[model samples]
Structures are given as C-alpha cells and as structure tokens.
Target chain A: MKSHFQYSTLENIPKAFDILKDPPKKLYCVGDTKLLDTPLKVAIIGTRRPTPYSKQHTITLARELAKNGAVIVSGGALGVDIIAQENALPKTIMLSPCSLDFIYPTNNHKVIQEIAQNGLILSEYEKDFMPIKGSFLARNRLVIALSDVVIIPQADLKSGSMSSARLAQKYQKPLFVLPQRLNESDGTNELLEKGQAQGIFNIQNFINTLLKDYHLKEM
Target chain B: MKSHFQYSTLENIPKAFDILKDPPKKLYCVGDTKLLDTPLKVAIIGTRRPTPYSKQHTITLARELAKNGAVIVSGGALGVDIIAQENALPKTIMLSPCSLDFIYPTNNHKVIQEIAQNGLILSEYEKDFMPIKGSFLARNRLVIALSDVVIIPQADLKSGSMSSARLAQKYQKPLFVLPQRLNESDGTNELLEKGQAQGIFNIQNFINTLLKDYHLKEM
Candidate 1:
C-alpha cells in the first residue's frame, strides 16, 4: 500500500505521519479508488435553514436517488442536507468543510456518524481543523467537485448553498436547482434567469439526466 | 380605434361583434394584451394558497418590477397574486381564462374590477365565457407567451402555475423561479432540478439579467 503521508497534503503529511501512519482502513474504501468506479454520486445541497417542504423533498429525492444505486452526498449540515442523508438507506457521503475529527454544526453529529458508517467521510481540511464561517464557504467547491451532479433543493438570496452553485459552474458539473416562489426566493429565481443552472422540477427528470449522462440503463 | 372584434378569435368573432354593436363605453383588456407597449413585462404567479414567506416575496418583487417599468401580470386569483398586485402600487393587469363578466374565483371580483379600471382585463374566451376547470391551464400559456419573462413566486408539484412554466419552455421565453424552502414547497423545488426553469438566488443577478435582456441600463 502507498504511504499515508503520500496521500496527505504537504502540510498535513508530517502530521498525518506522526499520527496513525497507516491509512484509516479498508473500510475507508467502499468502492474502487478510480473515480469512474465509484457509484454514480449526486450531491443534494440547500440552505441550512430549509423549510418542511424542502426537508421532505430532499429526503424523498435522496431516498429515490439512493434506491437507483447512486451514492448520495451532502454537507451533513442541518436542514435539507442532513435530511437528504438521513432519508437515505444506501451509502451517503458527507463532505464536511470542517475536519473529520471535528464536527461543525454539532447538532448533526448523529447523522454524520450514520453517514460515515454507510460511506466515506471526506474533507479538504486536516483531521483536527475546526470549521469557520469562511471555511464552510471554501468547502463548497469540494462538495460540487466530488459529485457527478449537484442538486440544490432551495436557497434564498444570502444562503451559503449558493457557493456550491457557483462552484458547480466552475467545475463544469451538471448543476440542478429547484424552482421556488419567485417573490420569496428572488435570488434563486434570478439565477434561473442568468442561464447558469439547469432547472430540475421533477424527480423522474433527475433520474433520467443522471442515467443518461452515465450511460447506465434504467433498472 | 379597432373594434373589439378584431381582437377576438375566429370562433368568437361573431360573438365579439354582437357585443361591440351594443358597446360599453370601454372594453378593458387585462393580463396579456394590456402590456402591448411595455417592452418589459413580468408575470407574478404563485399558488392561490401561499405560505406567508411566499406572500411577502411576491409583493416586494412585483412592486419593484412594476415600479421599474415592467407591467406586472397575474391571474388575478386570490392569495399571493392579489397580494402582489395590491402592493405593487399600480394595479397590475389580470389575464383570465374566463370571460370579462364571469369570475372563476368569485372572491377576486373586487380586485378584478380594480384591475380593469387601472390596468386591463384580457382573455382568450368570449365576453360571456366561463372558466372551465382546465381553462386556466390554457390561459397560463397565453400569459407566459405574451410576457417577455414569467416569474413564479410560489409553486408546488400540483400548482397550476406549472402550466406557465411549460408554456415558457414552449415559447422559449425566460422562466424565472424563486428558490423557496425545500420543505415548504416540494413542487417548486422539483421544477428547479429538472431544468424546466431557472433559479434566481441573487437579486442583483436577477435585475442585471432583466436589464440586459431588455437592453435597459442599470438604474
């Protein structure tokens, strides 16, 4: 096996070597390391303060997406992100902006643990790094970059979820956004008009796009 | 001035002439036709049953859009649509699937008349036409087609406002949807993800797109 230090970033390699030098374990590798070998992954992200409607839809879509063999991905934050992971029975990964050893938004620890057991926990930060406000903003790109598709459930004008949306554009991943009430969520509605994101209003279409993109046959 | 018969459909031309022969002082056109001269037109549509958040957004955006010179278009139905028009200062035009004399949702009669006096009332149906259950679905297309942009404030999977979205797609008009709380409105969220519409998550971005599309410089 390759040295754990080789895998760690230059700054973290020294610290990672000082700690348990060996990689975590085989459990960390749920699928092949080759990116293509990973299950079709889709990130379901939204405002941390989502409404009941957003929560329900995220969970429902997560469950359905998981049922179709895609590994669900989220920030593991409260609101729509956690609900999306919580609602899934299959492997659901959480990409925390915070370090793996530190849980930001402490309220979601239980769900975060559940996600770890089901799938890999990923973060660009070092193991002990705490998540600051700006870190959460910085981590959004990873959330979008690691996934095959990013589906934004509901985001207001000032919500952090918009960061992931911008990143999705930067990374050239298929970005899907749910349409909301134009008046209440004018920011989101405006994104629709700017022509950067694709509008995904139905679950069937979501599945169709994913399957079509991956060349996977419908089950 | 052109006779009202000139605006009537082939099937309804006879009926329109009959009414014009015994003309009322003014034949007000609401919704689609009233904004013929306005280069920028926006339709403020939402659920007849709106959440409090949706109600607030619709009013603010509608009023702002109207104040900025876009004619605010809506169904004249109760709930958020009425609230939007009422707050927008200049009463907005209403497009109905029903006739001028028939009010589909009788609760809106007062607002309907108010719109006729200040704005205009329009429909595809004849003067005595009653709104069939599916007539709104057909009328929604007209509303979307007539406007350069359609803004949906609050919608669900079952919300009839989707008819407008469908029509916008068919007409290739820009469809702008607000990002609501995912849990508050699954239907709207679903629409966003399927690429059926665009999300406007930023007010500045939204305003810029509108201004750019209409060739109006920023204020």
Candidate 2:
C-alpha cells in the first residue's frame, strides 16, 4: 500500500526542515513550509465558540503580529484558532493535532489549504493520525512549547484554551487572555482573574509586552 | 442643625486622615476609611454591565487584592464598583462624582453607610452637588489619582473605564486592566494591547508587577 504521506496534499519539505535547528529524521514536511522560517513564531488558540469580537480581535492582532514578521501558529480549528491563521499571510503555520490528511472540523479544509500554501500544515502525529478528541488535547502542549507566547483569545474556565494555558505555564511561556464582556462568557474572564492568562487587547501591546518581558525581537 | 460632617461621621476622621498624606482640610469620612491606615489602597473600576464571568472576577480579584492589605477604592456605582467595595473590608473610599449627600446608584445606600463609618466618601463635587452625565468622567481621574493602582475589572470600548485608564496614563499611575474574553469588549482589550494596562492573571503577579513598576512598598 502507498504511504499516507505520499497522498497528502502538502509537498513542501525543505522549508519545514530549515525551520528546525535539528530536523527530525523521519518527518515529512507538507504545504508551504518556507513561510515557517520567519524567525518569530506565535500561537493564538481558543475555543471554537468564539464571539464576534473575539474573532475580530484575533484576526486584527494576528495580521498585525504576522505583518511585523512573527509567524502565526494556530491549531487550525474554527473560531479564534482559524481566524488567527486566516488573518496572517500565507506564511502562518497551521499546527494541527490531527494527522496530515485529517481535517478535524472538516469545514476548515479551505482555510487549511490557504494557510498551507502560504505557510505549512504540521503535526507531531504520523500521517494517518486521526483528528480525535484526545489527540487535540495532547497536541496542545506542543502548541504551547513551540511558540514564545501563547494567546488565549476567548477561553472559558473549562475550555481547550485553558488546556493550552496550563501547558504554556508548564513551558514557562507567556500566556495571554483577552478579557471578555461582562456576563458574556465564563471562559476568558475566569482564566484572566485566576491569573492563568495575561490580558491582551491589541497586536502592538501584545508584541510590546512580549518584547519587553521576554526580550524577543520579530524575526 | 449640627453640620453632618462634624457630627455624623466625624468620629472616623483621625483614621481616615491617617490614610492620606495630604488629607483635604475639610472632609467627610465615610465607608471603609477606618481601615485606611493599615495597608495598600487600590481602586478597581469598570462598567456596570459586566459579563457574568467579569462580575465574578471583579469581586474575587477585589477581595484577593484587598486581603493583601490593598484598600479598595471605587466610584461606588453598581456592577464592578459595588463589587469592589463589597469585597473590601473596614471600608473603601467611595469617590463620588456627585454631592456628598448622594451615592448616585441610590441602591448602594447600605454600602454608602459602610463606607462612611469605616472608610470615607469623597467627592470633587461639593456637598449638595448632583451627579451629571459627564461628572463621572471627571470623577474617574480622581479615582485613578487617589489610588496606588487602578484595577479595571471589565469595561467596553466607550465605557468610563477608558477615562480612568487615560487618567492613570496621565498620572503615570500603574494601570491594571482585566483582559476579558476576546472580542468581549474593545475598550479594555485595546488598553491591554497598547500596554497602557498591565495584564494581571495571578494576584502575586499583580503584586510583584505593581511593586516593581511603581516602586511601592507594603503599607
């Protein structure tokens, strides 16, 4: 039988290999991995049920952050995750938890394709890894560890975004939470007040704080 | 009739006076002024229409911050204002934009009494001054200026919280904003993104940042 990696739509491997200091021997790069080489990479993750404002902020901040030379990393899910990727130029990486062929949300295929051509679609899972529930949760740590900062656009107390926040904490990466409206949702506000997430309002401030606190420069 | 300031709540003057370095020569001591001389004082201000999660965070953060010897200061309005005041003990200075006789929300009478007895009710407006629409905007500056830090629990794009944030900037006071859920409210998020407000997720982080940035000491 043909290998699943061969049937995959993503074809860019050299660019992805360059993104890593020590490329994995067995890994296969798919999509436009060249864009992943943009020095600075950031991940914006959150629940699929994002509000309009969350969607808007995610796009605006993502675009601004990416334009400033930061490679945007996201889970490729709907809501804030996809929005973050969609806002960026083709250079953003969609680091999905699912295998290269699996589209977890299904509807996000078009967006996933656009991002891959501009950046890369990556996952630690092997080529056939399904977009299962546990796989997504398991992938969150990688999402958190790979980036300098993890932004939780709009997460509730028990959101997947919260899982990412915990991983960010474990990785000692800065975790930012965008404050929600009063009485709106339980996700973002609870995490914010509990100290799990930093408050982020816009792209510049997010970049500024990241730069000042971590002494990071845009790639 | 005996002057209300001289007879009714004057007994708490000494405690309230100790709380301020430049105590207004003529004053009315009300609310949580009795606890003023003991520790740090912070004002948590935001809009009245908070998301359910924000209301919870406002109250919890207020209480948590106050327990660390930070006296809570607010405008004594409903929602975030009253929650902050309620979370504080002894009393919190109720800086009213209206007359000394009015606690604009009206329903906050009991809270006003608590403030008057233990704290202080201060107003830029004179004794008989009534609250006008724009008075709160002016009053927001005093609230920002009077406290060591300004904690914005939840505010929208046009909410009065922005006024306080601007005032904090002008005064160079440490401005802390609660980052709500993404897309929840543009106001607080903009402040966070712009670096005008410090993102506070943990109480210790808040304390450490507040102390480090402002060069503050435990009172």
Candidate 3:
C-alpha cells in the first residue's frame, strides 16, 4: 500500500470526474491508473446480500462486459459487488468510499486487496479521512459519473442500490436490471414494472448491446 | 380414440398449408382445431437428446411465448421438443409424423395424450399408415409450415435439428437459436457465427418479439 499507491488530482485525473455533482479533488489510486484514460466503462452495483440468482448474473454480466470492451466499475463491497470485482478480474475499477489505505468490510480484505493489486481502485477521500453514512451513497454518485451505463443486478426496496439507481437515471446513463420474480427483487422488479429501464436478459445479448452502445465495434 | 380424434382434409385445415413444398392433403386433428383459425404460431424444434441448458431454455422460451400469445409448435418427440410441449401447455400444437393412433416414442404417451386432450395434435398420416424413414424429416416440414417463426434451442451438428434448421430457412420463417459454447452446441453455435439467425437471448425479449411480430397485439 505504501509503495504502489499514488494519487491523481483533478487537473491530471480523467475528465469523467467533471460530471460528478461535486468533482472529486483527487482519486487515491492503486493498480494501473493508466486505464483512467479508457472512457469505456460500465458499472454493476447491487445489494450487499444478493440472492443466488442475482449473484450469478452479476458475475456473468460483469465478466462478459469486461470481456467485451468495457471496464467493470464497482464498489468492491461484499455480496454482488465483490462477485463483480473478482469475476471481472484485472479489468475492474472499484471506487471506494474511504481512502485506498482503509478497506471497508474488513473481512473482504483479501478479495479487495487482490483487486487493488491487479485492478484499479479509486477513492476521492484522503488516506485518513473516515467515511460517514453520507459519503457511502455519495460514493455511489461517483460510480454513476464514470459509467456509460449502470446495472443493478438485484436490489431490494430499501438498499443503497435504489439510491444509485436513481443516480444512474439522473446522470443519464443507460440503466439495466435483471428480470426477476415479483416478490424476490422488488426494487429491480419495480423498475421493470414501471417500464423504463431495460433488463439484462442474456449475457451475450447484453454484450452486444454494450458493444454497440459504447462503440466497442459497429452496431 | 376415434370419439375424440377427427380429421380435417385440405380446405378445412388452416390455409397455412399453401406455403409447404407439398401441401398436406389432410390433417388428422384432436383438441380444438378452432384455434387453427388463429395464425399466431411459433415453432420450437430441437435435438431429441438436449443439453440441460437447452432443455431448461426451451421450457422457458416456449412457456413465455405462449403466455405472450403465440402458440408453441413442436414435433412432441422427446428432449427439447417435448419440453416445449409440456411447459407451453394448452397453447401448444404438435405436428407428428405418425397417425394419432401410433404415438411414436411410446413412453411419452401420458404427456402426449394430455396435449391431444387439452391442447392439439395434428398429423398428415392416416390412422393405419406406418411411418417411413422419409416421414420424420418431412414431418419437420409441417412443423415449420404452421409456424410464423422457428427456434432451435440447441443443435449438435449430426442431430435432426440441423435438417429442420435448413427447412426453417427454406420455409423463410425467422429462425432463432440459443447462444451456447462452441464444443457443446456446434450446430446452433455455428448458425450464430454464420451471422444471420437471431438468438433467443432473453425469455422476456423473445415474448415481446413474439407478441409484436405475430399480431398478438399492436406492434
């Protein structure tokens, strides 16, 4: 952490930061921040406790999206978030709420550290600044800022995911949800029922959509 | 069997026969041939021995298409074909090579009779006719004839589905296949790589396409 970690202040950081409600003054960086230049990014955010169905789809979708040209963006938390981070591998970006020095949900340290070593982790907060309740959802705002699109693989009604989902819409990123049964993932199901956000129905189909939408290749 | 099964010769059977290479001269019918008046039909044809992935997808695709307003059409043989029939229920129409008197597989009798009783079964062969080797592939011809679209969930290169896949092309029905790994479902994966056929990437997306294309409602 002491030797490899670095920082990118606003003028030198990727310009995608400009879109955030409050532009991050700097991103505490780990791994190859070189791809901070690759604007092709897709965010996958979901509940801390995912149903098996949701967890599996999250892994597949993130891996397929990364395999198809977009960098995977996540918070690297437990459940679907780490599922996204670990499966998508060396092609992921985890935006942390606290500084790069402090890995939250301490038990997930091994997985989170692997991503830090092999993938990129970005944090706006300084190394010693403690994260508060407000900063967690605020981290979600930064997640949406970097995404060309956002997917909530599963969301219960009251999770922080619903907040990020609203941020995805407010940020104008194309949002997708996994189609699920009525009583299971009520937040995602609710979005589908409302008839606006698209659903990631097939891993292959989603890749096609991601490629065409993000200019990975010809539509 | 004679009490419930009846016959509909040329003019009385649905006029879809006009497109077949050799129009079926007569159709031995059971269940409500009245829906023959409804032209919203989708054929789901596949290998006799299905991969588990293929079988599960066939059930979901056929059931959702029926629930979305298209009749599920198949040969009612084993594996994916029968999987489609049972899950799709009273909304299915199976085209058989043999007469209503001879159930081909013999073991699927219970499931076959239920469809003949609650759904519908159609055959071109007369009650006493013993099917020739020529009849089975030719029966596939009839399966495509009643269909507005055709889906082959999984196809190994040597299986019967490849022949029907060719027939689906010859019939000019929109052909769909599932996206599968190369070594597993070579026939379907080959078709996908060849770049013309669509893949049923999502059960819901397939349903929406079915309803929109078949006049189940406003496109």
Candidate 4:
C-alpha cells in the first residue's frame, strides 16, 4: 500500500491553533482534512498506563463524544490517547510527533493508519522528518490546541500526560477529568484540588452540556 | 451481660431534632451521651448492599471523620451503616428503629452492643417496642436530622439510601458522595447529577474543610 498524505499551509491551519506558544507553520495530514472544520473538537489525553477506572471512562467518554458529533482529538500513542481514538473510530483525529510519511511509534503505527482511514492524522513537521528529541512533547501542544475541550481520564502527578494537561490549561480549553479518588489518579485529582478543571460527574450530563448548542439547533 | 439504657424527654433532645418534620417526643439511649454534643456530626448511610468501592470508602471516610473530632452517625444496621459505625468505633452514633431493648437486626445485635459500649445508641420507641414494617425507613430520617453533613458512598436508583439522601437535602445539610462514574452508583450520582450534592474528590481535603473550624480552634 502507498503512504499517502497532503500538506496545508499555515494559513489553512484551524484558527484554534493560533493560541499555541509555538504555532505550526504548516500541517501534514492523512485522511479527511475537513475534520478540522468540525464545530466540536474534544481532546482526550492521559497516562500511557491507566487504571481500569480511567480506561473504562476514556473509552465511554470518547464514544459518547463521537456519537454527539464531536471529532475526538488525541495523540496517536497508547493508553488513553489510542483508547479514545479507537472508541471514537472514524470521528477521531490524531496529532503526530513526526511527519505524516512515518508515524513515530513503531508499536502504534498500525493503529495510527487505522484511525487515519476516515479520520484525520496531523503532524507539524514536513515529509520524512522522523521524531526528534522533544518532538513528542511538542506534539502534545498541538493536541490541546486542536480541541475546544480537553478530557484527562488518568494521569500521574509527574508524567507526560500532566505536561499536556498544562498545555490545555495554558490554552484555556474547558478542561475536564474523570471523577477519581485521591492517590488513585493523582495528576487529575491535583487539577481538581487546584480548581483548574471540573470533574466529569456524569457522562450524559457532560455530553448534554457540551452539545447543548447543537441540540438547540436540532430542535 | 445485662443491657443498660436511659431515656430523655423531647425537651432534652438535641436542638438539631427541631428540624425534623416528625420530632421524637422521647428518646432511649445507651452509652456516653456526650457523643451527641460533639459539635460535629456526619451521618454516612448507603445501600444494604454495596459495591466494594463504597464499602472501602465508607470505612476510610468514617475513620477519618472520627479522627477529626466528628462523631459518625448511621442506622447501626447492616452494610454501609454497620461499616461506618464499626470503623468510627468509640466516636460513632447509631439511631435505632426499635427501642434500645431490641437493637433490631439479630445478626448485627452483637456488633450493636459493641458500639454502644462507648458510642451512643438512641431510639424513639419505648421498651419492648419490637421492629415493625416501615420502621427502618423512619429511622433513616433521624440519621439525616442529627448530622451536620451526609455521605452516601453508594446506592441504587430506588434504594432506601436515596431516601436518607433526600432528607439531607430537605434538612439543607451539606451532602457529599464518593466521586463515581454513572451507571456504577446511580443513586449517589443522581444526587450529583441534580447538583444536590458535591462529590468528595479528596478524602483529606474533605476532612480538612469539614474540620476547618476544629483546626482553627486548635490553633
């Protein structure tokens, strides 16, 4: 099978990207570029290792968001990110660390291509630019920048997931975390402790509130 | 061992009882009455059957509350009720459906007397006033009426635990629940869904806030 991708100039990047500290100059993409124009873009990110609680919630929240017309955004990596995209399927989007010519993680390349079938895969770098030091970290900002809301299903107090959570905070996206216990998922709970994010107490309530405008338009 | 109990008229009941729609005219008691005047009362009530999550949390929360100078309150029956009182031990109170002569549940009677050794047990019914239909439901109201806060760690949609939670709402007591996912603990989540109660995000944070007055006094 041929590796296929296209390029979009900086001018073509969604307006939401402008808030990034270092905004992308151009974006490399696979699959439908129109996914960028979806009015609802929710990013779901978390630790590579998740408790069963977080795993279950990430899947459910992602699926529900997709059903409600939101294109779920995430890194094409493991744990929460991949779980979200797989659950959301064709309605998902992935932010890549390397160029679209080679999706970074050897382990996740298969999943990356699967999500890119009908969804979108985005990378800031150009052709053949493999992942460099800190490229993955840089990709996290794009993940946050692409979405109107961010959900962290699970994260540690000091982990890559927490850093992405910080980007979400910096971008002023409406951040939400799974309702978790203390010492269970410390990073997300710390956000709740600091009043930086709201806990998703109920899935339907969260979806209803987030898509109230869409529902109103339907009526 | 001989059972010991004493009675106080309505005039001697704690001023908190005035909030009840149906106040007791007389009260039967065993053990130290000072538990009633501890200045901090937190009633923890939940389903007769609980998920392991609820049972563990109920134990921890009860123990913490007692350590913080709050006398935990419950029905002294099974499930969450017994679990709370046992964990809180000497710093707990049980409101009974039957008179002090009969602690109601035959299986839990031994545990009841164990709690009564230092904790308080109160009942409205006089001597030999055996258990009857609807008595347990009636006892639930008193559990809420005496507490400064209420925590229903787990419950079903139409369980008796929800009724006690309603009494907390009616009495305008601060109600807290274990942070839970939907479909897992529907009754408690429904209270959260309706914004009737705030979820307990952190055990220490909750205790600290609930006992802030005590901390200030200690200082």
Candidate 5:
C-alpha cells in the first residue's frame, strides 16, 4: 500500500484544505485522487458507537447527498462514519488518522481497502507513521476543513465529532446536525445549544439546500 | 364551572394579550386572573398522542421552566398539553377553545377543574358558545400570544402544535422545540428546518437562557 501511495504537497492540495487555520504540509493518498477536486463535498461524522436511529439516518443522508453530486467525506472509523462511507461508496473520501501502510483500528482494514479500491483514502501521515492520541483529533480538523459542509448525525459531548464541529465552525463552513433525542446526542445537542451549528430537521430539504447553494455559488 | 366564570374586558386583560395582531375583545376566566399578570410566561404544547419520550421530556421541561419563574401555559387538550399542565399544576394556565360552559375534551374535565380552582382557565368564547373547526386554530394564536415564549415537545406537520408554532413566529415570539428522533417529530423538525424555530437541545441550558434573557429584559 505504501509503495502505491501518491503524495500532494500544499501547492497541489485541495484549495479548501489550504484555507484551514493549520493546513497539512502534504497529503498521502490512495485510490481516486480526483475526488479531492470535487467542487461540492460534505463531511459526515459521529461516534464510533451510534444508536440504530443514527445509523439509519447516516445511510439516508449519505445516499441522498451523494445522489445530489456532493462527495461524501468522513474519517474511516466505525459507526456513523463507516456507515456513511459504505452507503456513499465510490463517491466517498475517507481520511485516516494513521498512514496508509498501517490501518489503525484493524477492524476497519477491510473497509479501508474497499474505499481505497473504489473511492479515496487520505492520510496526512507518511508511511510507517503510527497514530497517537492526538493524531485522531488533528485528523478531524482536516475532515471538516476539506469539505464544503459538515453534517453530524450523532455525537457525544467529548468525541471526535465535536472536535470536527468546532473546526467546521472555525472555518466558517456550514455545520448541520441531525436532530436527535435529547439524551441520545449530547455532543450535537451541545453544539446546537451553543449556537455553533444549525439543526437539520429534514434531511432531504437540507441536501436540497446544500446542492442549491453550491450550484448558485458555481454559477 | 360556569357559575365560577368571570369576564375580563380588554380594559383589564393581561398586557401580553394586547400585543397580539388581533387581540380578543373579552376574556372569560376562572380562578386567579392575577396569574396572567406574571411577566414571564411560557407555553408548552404538542400533539394529543405523543411518544413516551415526548411525555417524559414535556414534564421535565415544564417543571424546570416553572421552577425558573415561568408561568406555564397550554391549551387544555389531551396528551402532551394535559401532561405538561398536570406536572406544572397550579403554576399553569390552560386556554380553552370552547365556552366556559363546556369542556371540549371531556376527558380533561378533572384537570380543567383543577386549573380553574388553582391556576387560571381562559377563553375568548362566550359562556354558551360552542367550539367550531376553526376555533382551535384561532385559540392556538391566543396560546402563543398569551406567553413570553412557546415550546413544542412533539408534533406532526399538520397538528395544532404547528399552528401555534406559526402563530408564535408571526407574533415574533421565541419558539423553542424539543429535539427528537427525526421520524418521530416531523412538524417540529420542519419548523427547525425552515428556521421558524430554534432547537432546544439542552433543557437546563434552555431554561437558563430563558430566565437570563427574561431577567435582562426586566432589568
């Protein structure tokens, strides 16, 4: 995998990532690098352990978003992120916390291989770079910054999703959260309470707005 | 109930009622009319048939809001409305669509009687007037207009809760909705989607904000 990995320096990286507060110096990627050039991209993220409702909605949101021509991006972890990429398949981008040479979770190695074969797998770390506690947090910012919009289906108050939410807000991108039962989504709920992200009540309407706004911007 | 009914002309009605687009000419009331004089009032409403989650959260929200010095108000109907009033008890006001002579939903007669004896029961309809199809819709406006804020715990897109939500928005009052599972709360979700209402993610934080703003307003 490391031998097949291709790299892009800051000069050739996605323009969206360049605007980040702390942009990555280089991107080690596999699969379809052209995915990085997609004009409309959305990042969907949440907890590694999600409720059945969150899982179901993740699929629906990702499918609809991809059908509308928006490239779906997410961290290649379990739960909502993996569910989203699986559904959005071939039109997705998975950002890994560790290098392509090593799959961090081990459990998601197959999923990573699938995405690398059909979609795009990205990592800021070079070959043989092992993930640290801070690597996932740092990687979350790139997931948020590389997309046109960020959607959180479910998240805890102290999860990576919240980290991405903060970065999305900091970058002034549209951060939309799926409304969840009060106790079920503490992280996203906290975001809404603090006025850091807008609530997405209707997934279809939200996708329509995303596409319409992106279309208008292109025009 | 009819014998205990007292009428308040526009001259002596609550000041909040005066701010409505079409203020009622006369208000027939039972129990302490002074309850209406409370400066901070909040209306909690929802569908007649609500999920257990909605019922549970409604009580928590109403109880906390009442504890925070808000006068809880609602339509004296079944489901979430009646449950909210039951928990809030004497601190609540129930606005009826029919005349004081009739209890539109006979199931809530006991609750209505309790409110009349302890809290306040209000209606713009005369003592002998019967409720019509449009009466509930008209009454919903008063529910919103008679309060400082409006809250919907759960509602379908076509329910009376949505009616009150629109009235609240039109009247420029703060409309707060309890966040729920996407499929379980289409109406309130639609309101959040269209930006007609803000999501109440954390009930405690929501109550805090409400009291803080109300206190600031008073100061």
Candidate 6:
C-alpha cells in the first residue's frame, strides 16, 4: 500500500534498464527502493513449481550473492522466486506482475508484505490492476532489465523462467544456470546445450566471476 | 585367431587414418576390413558401464547411423562401445587397445570373434601384447582419428569417453553427446558446458547434421 512513482531519470532507477528495447517510462515501488541503487544486481529466476533441489539451490545462490553485495531480483511468484527473495531478505527486489495493491498469489501475501517493508517491491502495472497471462511474460523482461546477471536454478522447456532466459539473452546479460542432474532441469540444460548460458558448478567460482566484473568496473 | 597386417596405402588401410598425428604404421585386422572403406564413419564412445538410458541411446544411434550407410567405430570395450558395435553389426569397427590375439575383456570374446568375421577389428598392438594403462588413453586418440564425428553417450568427468571428447576437440572433429536428464551424464554435460560437444536432442536431426557434411563431401 505504501508506494511511490519514479520517472526514468529519478533516483532508484537501474542503469541496465536503459538497455531495454521498451523500457518502462515509470516504476511504482514499495519498501527500501534504494536497494535498486546497488551497483551489483543479479536476478534469480526459475519455474513456479521447482524441485526441492532447485528450491535449495535458489535460496543458496540468492543468499550467497546477496552476501557478496548483489541485490537479488526475482518475480514474486512461487517456487524459485519466493524462495530466493525469502532467503535474500532485505537485499532483494520482487518484481510483481500485478499491481502492488493486488498480490497475485494470496498465499505469498505475508512474504510480499515483508518484502514491501524490508526489501523492495516493484510493479509496472497500476494499483488494483489484475494481470493477464501475457503480463507475467512482460514482467520478466523488467526483471532481467534490472539485473547485471541472471541465474536460472531450474525450469522446463516451456516456462516463465525460459522466457526470462530469452529476455536475458536478448539483453546480452551474463546468464548462468545451476548444474542439475540430467532429467531434472530441461530448460536449463537446453540453455547450456545451445551455448546460451554458462553452467555454475561451484558457488565460490560463480561469486568470483560476478565480482570479477564488479571489480573491473571499479577500475 | 585370424588376423592380417596391412601397411598404410594398402586397400584395407582406412583413409581417415592418415589424419592421425602418428598414423599406425601397420594395422592388424580381422574380418571384413573392407567396412573401413565406408565414406561416413562415426565413433560412438562412452563409459565401460553405462546407464540404461545411455545404453539404449547408444544402440539406437549406432543402428540408425549404420542403417544410413555410416560405419560405426567404437573402442570394442564393455558398456556403450560394445553395445553400439553389437547393434550396428557388420557395418562397425572395433578398435582394440590390446593385440588382436588377446581380447582384453574375456567375456566379450564371442563378440570379438563375431566382429573379426562379420565386421572389422583393428589394433596397433602386437599379436600377444598386453595393454598398459596409457594404452587406453592412446587408443582414444585413434578413435577420434578414425571418425568424421564422435558421439559420447555417457561418461564421468574422468572417464575414457571424456578423453575421446578432448581428442575430438583437439582434432577439430564434430562431437555430439546424447542428451540426458540433469545429473545423469556429468561428463557429457561438462563437455557441453566447455563447448567441447553439441547435444543430440533428436536422432534424425543429428543424422541430418552429419549427412549434411557428408553430402557436401559428395560434391
């Protein structure tokens, strides 16, 4: 319910947002909106209904990346999204598909409320606006646009996570996928097969690779 | 028990063998050595012990490729190699690490004999030579040297198939891996991750890609 509108040039706008083909003219945000000003931002995305392994991986990646001073960005949906934001806590951004006033999945209302106060909640839609099927896909672009890198913990060939992957690729963002057992994550494996994303096998290496770029920027 | 030695430039010496860094000075052959004359040859290599999915995929790939007039080349060991050669039947080549006289795995003696008569068996070792540890790794180079394409059905990070994959990359040969569920084929996935191999999602497409090069050669 506590939200403010910011135009393209105002504070809290991510630099990566400028690269979007159709970037949002304005953003409605709640909670610690200043989190968007973080120089290192990573998006953790995956299927709405992830396997336990994927859920664990998502949380671990989010927590580890957040600890490394990266603001975690995710769709505030079930599975990987919620898990990542929940673990990342105060250093996360939940990009909701629907308006801030109407939380899509009522079950996540409590966490959404916490994120609105502790982290940051962003929406491209207006207050009280309900989302259509295309809205989620549309919102995915924003998630990728707001992040320096994208991580997919698990996803099928046909899922919202894949959509985020496509958008990440289109945006030329460095995308990484958590290595999974064969038969577990088809979408992630397909991305690796097609040379679309790099595989993240070791956590330390992943963080180092991310921070390497951040360090290069410091120079 | 029955073998013939052929020097390079002899009718039985496969033309592809010329591409080897140290092409065998003389090849000891058993059975239809003429099968080496087949223009399109593909090496199917993997672990000595394969999963059921890998075994099935190996057989299907070998049979299908052989049916399309491609001679299947394999290490003639247990698991994926023998299964592929066994299913591909007379249009296959089993490159043994030891001498033609000494079939390494005693259990595959029957298949070795069958290949000696029905298919083609080639070895660089002496008639009674026992293999040392380096022999298997050395033999893998020849596998890649003998084929236009290399397919890894399954392998661990430290397996013979991974060695072949490295050799394939070194030789600049087109390498393909059978797609599996995540966690199923770590070696193959790592190869994909490192850009050492392409994933074989559809059998027909794989054959088409292979034949696409073959058709170009026909010109």
Best by TM-score: 4
- The full ranking of all candidates by DockQ, starting with the best, is 5, 4, 1, 2, 6, 3
Summarize candidate 2's per-residue lDDT along B186-217 as a digit string, tens digits: 68777876667766655556666555554555
DockQ, per model, reads 0.36, 0.32, 0.05, 0.42, 0.63, 0.22
Q: Write the per-residue lDDT of candidate 6 for residues B55-159, one digit (tens) a residue.
A: 877888898888777899988888888899888888988888888767767777777777877888778876667678888887777788988889998888888
Task: Report lDDT (Cα) of residue A168, candidate 3.
Answer: 81
Residues B105-127 of candidate 1 have per-residue lDDT tens digits of 67766666566556656666667
Better of 2 and 3 by lDDT: 3
Q: All candidates: CA RMSD in angstroms?
A: 8.8, 7.5, 7.0, 3.3, 3.9, 4.7
CAPRI-style docking class of model 1 based on DockQ: acceptable
Chain B TM-score (model 4 vs. true structure)? 0.91
Alpha-carbon TM-score of each model against the true structure:
0.59, 0.60, 0.62, 0.87, 0.86, 0.84
lDDT of 5 by residue, B1-219 (tens): 343455453337777778787888887777777778776899999999989989988999888777667889998889988988888878999888888877767888888888878988888887687778788888888889888888898999888887788788888889888887778989988887777888777677778888888783211
Model 5 CA deviation exceeding 4 Å by range: A1-16, A20-26, A216-219, B1-11, B20-22, B212-219
Candidate 3 chain A least-lDDT 10 residues = A1-10
> Weakest 10 consecutive residues, lDDT, candidate 6 chain B?
B1-10
Q: For residue A204, what is the lDDT in candidate 4? A: 73
DockQ of model 6 vs. true complex: 0.22
Per-residue lDDT of model 5, residues A13-40, tens digit only:
7777787778888887878888888878
List runs of model 6 lying over 4 Å from the truth: A1-18, A21-26, A179-186, A216-219, B1-11, B179-190, B216-219
Considering DockQ, which of the candidate structures 2 and 4 is the better prediction for this target? 4
User: Comparing candidate 1 with candidate 5, which one achieves the higher DockQ?
Assistant: 5
All candidates' lDDT scores? 0.63, 0.67, 0.76, 0.81, 0.81, 0.79
Model 1, runs deviating above 4 Å: A1-36, A96-105, A123-141, A156-160, A182-190, A217-219, B1-219
True-structure RMSD for candidate 5:
3.9
Q: Which candidate, 4 or 5, has the higher lDDT?
A: 5
